[PDB]
Design a protein around this nucleic acid. Structure first.
Lengths: 217, 121, 341, 121
RNA sequence: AAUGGGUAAUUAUAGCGAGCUAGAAAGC
RNA sequence: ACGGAAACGCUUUCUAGCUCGCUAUAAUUACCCA
């Protein structure tokens, strides 16, 4: 058979994140570590590439028996969810990480927000000669929230591995909450919560009753 | 008026046409203008260039209307800036904005002033 | 889960100012009641270009009259009879000190705030505060920092703590492993705007400075999470209490002795010196940075050829300044205690 | 000046005629110029080299203008970027760009300076 | 001692700058 | 009574798979000036 089921979630930032960004034509005084933004609404983005990238390497401390040293040395539970290139069966693997977009921009006008990002001064202090080294790095503001879709393929090759993979998906989402998703991270800048963990089938026929009881539990 | 094809040369010609130490000829040609005070001038525009990028001019027109006043107040305190807001046509070219791409061009003119001030001194 | 976490509670003995680089000028506040009112000056000039007073305001701003009472923007309001003071911004109530021709403070530095206008302490500030403690109390990191001698003893080596990707090697990076989060934002009732007070040796006065800082009140409980992912990092954040005591003991023996004991504060918990305020000798490897730090000041305001000036302020006493009269503090003398979850 | 001829052979000749650490005999003969200061200028010319392939030249006039500001400002900060923009005639080659085929010649010239910067040490 | 005031410095620094696999296959 | 007439160089085929814009970094220091 064939089915595709869709993990929805709502990413709430805490001490909001800095997924580092684009522009070289910036300024002499203004934001010099820009954040990645939508080119059309200029709202901050969590790209799905960084979500998948943190999620692999946080799941790979846990799900690799032998140490990685490369992707395509992951342990056939991460090769099937994130793809290898060098397994014949695990190349397109089973998970699509869409880019998260800023959802509550109207809620963050009822709170007194001038702009949906903030600029934060950060200052390398030298420990001899005490000279300072300032910088203005941008980050999305704290109570920003994001739509989060993550699509999963269930073919016949997902014979009985759907539940075993959803353990890994809800293990990786709770493991990103213990870590930081891009940016400085050791200096704040990271802490992400996932609310409303909800899986629905978008194609095919599959039961999402028993799926939403290792998500919300 | 400053246009996209001349403002850097205007800024160089303004930093050169600017007074220096007549006395104290131990390391001469040092300006009666310091780097901290000119970065104080650029600080007024650095938090409008980002919002010239992000959001619309009809929420920044109020902040430009106060930017006139910020340059007036900085001109009044020290006489070093006072002979820079006249040499560089800052109060003249601040009334010339009326949209986004002249606000951005004015902020780039301020950065060009800071760039040539670091380059000479 | 190797992520052993810690919860740091930070009490403020002295007022702590942090952040932001911005400063209100001497004409950007209102002192009507016992409450310094900092308005959004764009709306203040919007409301007052409608009252024909924008040219009168431009005349006010270059108007350096004597009696600074008449140069602090209350005089512009009460002079031309402006009673509608409904602008965005915030009030912080007065200390009662720093007076009388009162209200004539000049430039305050805004405390670091998030986008909602609620102030907080960032974890990069407190992580740098932890980093000087951990550098100073290590006889591996003190020794060979001040290096290269080329420009003018110019910089720390920055590699006594091994940092980087480091091609070929495994990824150690000790201070990637210590991860200090920011704080949940406190309310801006907690800010008081202490001034600054230079207490000096060889001329035993207490000369004030025209610097004003929106600082946290003394005795404010602040929270942080510090997670560690490595054995060595977790050992260090266990040892932070002992190492902060060791840093402060080698600091009072270095600097605070020769300054009189009433000017200093007690500890009551584990000592720490957080951001703006406290002088050069908390943001340094102070034993390797003596002559090369005073070497930088051939100016009009020389770092006097001694290990410097004690940095006091003035704020109300509560619960504290058990040692001196007329209410001196130490600007960044704070405390913490860590506990593991 | 640089033509569609030797403009790359200029850039290599600029790198070998650039000052080194005669001191520091631990992997010696290395530049004072650090490669991050030079990639921060290649970042500018790289975005312009990409946009010149798509947009017009009148739609790059402000952007190109800002180039001079950065090559001035980065020169006023470090003396190493200062003799970079003096040995390689970058402020002079910036005044010469007037067409998209000349903009791209400057934008590839900076890539040649970065290529030979990595090729030597 | 008064009274008027702030003044100066740094404005990001050091890196990575893409890597691998496929490089046309069947037919008429 | 044109070595000519008639005859689609056409059908099928994802520039695709893998990849964290990341690492370190107190908005700080000096204390004065008319």
């Amino acid at each position: 058979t064939f089915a595709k089921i869709k993990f929805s979630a709502q990413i709430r930032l805490e001490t909001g994140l800095h997924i580092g960004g684009s522009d070289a034509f910036a300024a002499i005084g203004a934001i010099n570590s820009p954040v990645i933004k939508d080119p059309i609404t200029n709202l901050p983005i969590i790209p799905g590439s960084s979500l998948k990238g943190k999620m692999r390497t946080l799941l790979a401390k846990v799900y690799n028996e032998k140490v990685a040293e490369k992707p395509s040395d992951d342990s056939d539970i991460l090769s099937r969810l994130f793809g290898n290139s060098k397994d014949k069966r695990f190349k397109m693997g089973r998970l699509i990480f869409r880019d998260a977009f800023l959802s509550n921009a109207d809620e963050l006008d009822s709170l007194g927000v001038r702009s949906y990002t903030e600029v934060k001064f950060e200052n390398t202090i030298d420990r001899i000669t005490a000279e300072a080294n300032p910088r203005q790095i941008e980050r999305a503001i704290r109570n920003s929230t994001f739509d989060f879709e993550l699509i999963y393929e269930i073919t016949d090759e997902n014979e009985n591995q759907v539940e075993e993979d959803f353990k890994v998906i809800r293990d990786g989402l709770k493991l990103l909450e213990l870590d930081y998703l891009g940016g400085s991270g050791s200096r704040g800048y990271g802490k992400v919560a996932f609310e409303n963990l909800k899986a629905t089938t978008v194609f095919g026929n599959y039961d999402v009753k028993t799926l939403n009881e290792l998500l919300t539990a | 008026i400053l246009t996209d094809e001349n403002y850097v040369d205007i800024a160089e010609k303004a930093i050169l046409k600017l007074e220096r130490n007549t006395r104290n000829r131990k390391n001469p040609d040092a300006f009666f203008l310091t780097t901290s005070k000119l970065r104080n001038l650029l600080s007024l525009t650095s938090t409008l260039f980002d919002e010239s990028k992000v959001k619309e001019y009809d929420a920044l027109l109020d902040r430009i209307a106060y930017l006139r006043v910020q340059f007036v107040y900085q001109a009044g305190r020290e006489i070093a800036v006072k002979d820079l807001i006249e040499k560089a046509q800052i109060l003249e070219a601040l009334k010339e904005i009326k949209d986004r791409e002249t606000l951005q061009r004015f902020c780039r003119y301020m950065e060009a002033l800071v760039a040539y001030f670091k380059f000479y001194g | 889960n190797d992520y052993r976490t810690f919860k740091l509670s930070l009490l403020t003995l002295a007022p702590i100012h942090i952040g932001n680089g911005e400063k209100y000028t001497s004409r950007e506040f209102i002192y009507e009641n016992k409450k310094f009112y900092f308005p959004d000056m764009g709306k203040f000039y919007n409301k007052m270009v409608e009252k024909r007073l924008a040219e009168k305001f431009e005349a006010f701003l270059i108007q350096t009259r004597p009696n600074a009472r008449n140069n602090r923007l209350i005089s512009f309001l009460n002079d031309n009879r402006i009673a509608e003071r409904s602008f965005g911004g915030y009030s912080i109530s007065e200390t009662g000190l720093e007076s009388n021709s009162a209200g004539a403070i000049n430039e305050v530095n805004k405390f670091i705030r998030d986008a909602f206008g609620n102030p907080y302490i960032p974890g990069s500030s407190l992580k740098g505060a932890i980093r000087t403690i951990l550098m100073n109390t290590t006889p591996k990191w003190n020794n060979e920092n001040a290096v290269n001698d080329f420009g003018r003893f110019p910089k720390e080596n920055k590699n006594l703590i091994p940092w980087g990707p480091k091609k070929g090697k495994e990824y150690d990076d000790l201070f990637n492993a210590i991860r200090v989060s920011d704080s949940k934002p406190f309310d801006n009732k907690s800010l008081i705007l202490v001034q600054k007070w230079d207490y000096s040796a060889k001329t035993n006065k207490a000369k004030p400075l025209p610097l004003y800082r929106e600082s946290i009140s003394p005795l404010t409980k602040i929270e942080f999470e510090i997670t560690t992912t490595t054995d060595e990092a977790g050992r260090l954040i266990e040892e932070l209490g002992k190492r902060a005591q060791a840093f402060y003991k080698d600091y009072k023996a270095f600097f605070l002795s020769e300054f009189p004991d009433d000017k200093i504060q007690a500890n009551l918990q584990y000592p720490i010196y957080l951001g703006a305020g406290s002088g050069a000798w908390t943001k340094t490897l102070f034993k390797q940075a003596d002559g090369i730090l005073q070497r930088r000041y051939s100016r009009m305001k020389t770092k006097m050829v001694k290990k410097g000036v004690l940095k006091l302020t003035k704020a109300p006493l509560k619960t504290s300044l058990v040692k001196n009269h007329e209410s001196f503090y130490e600007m960044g003398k704070a405390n913490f205690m860590i506990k593991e979850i």
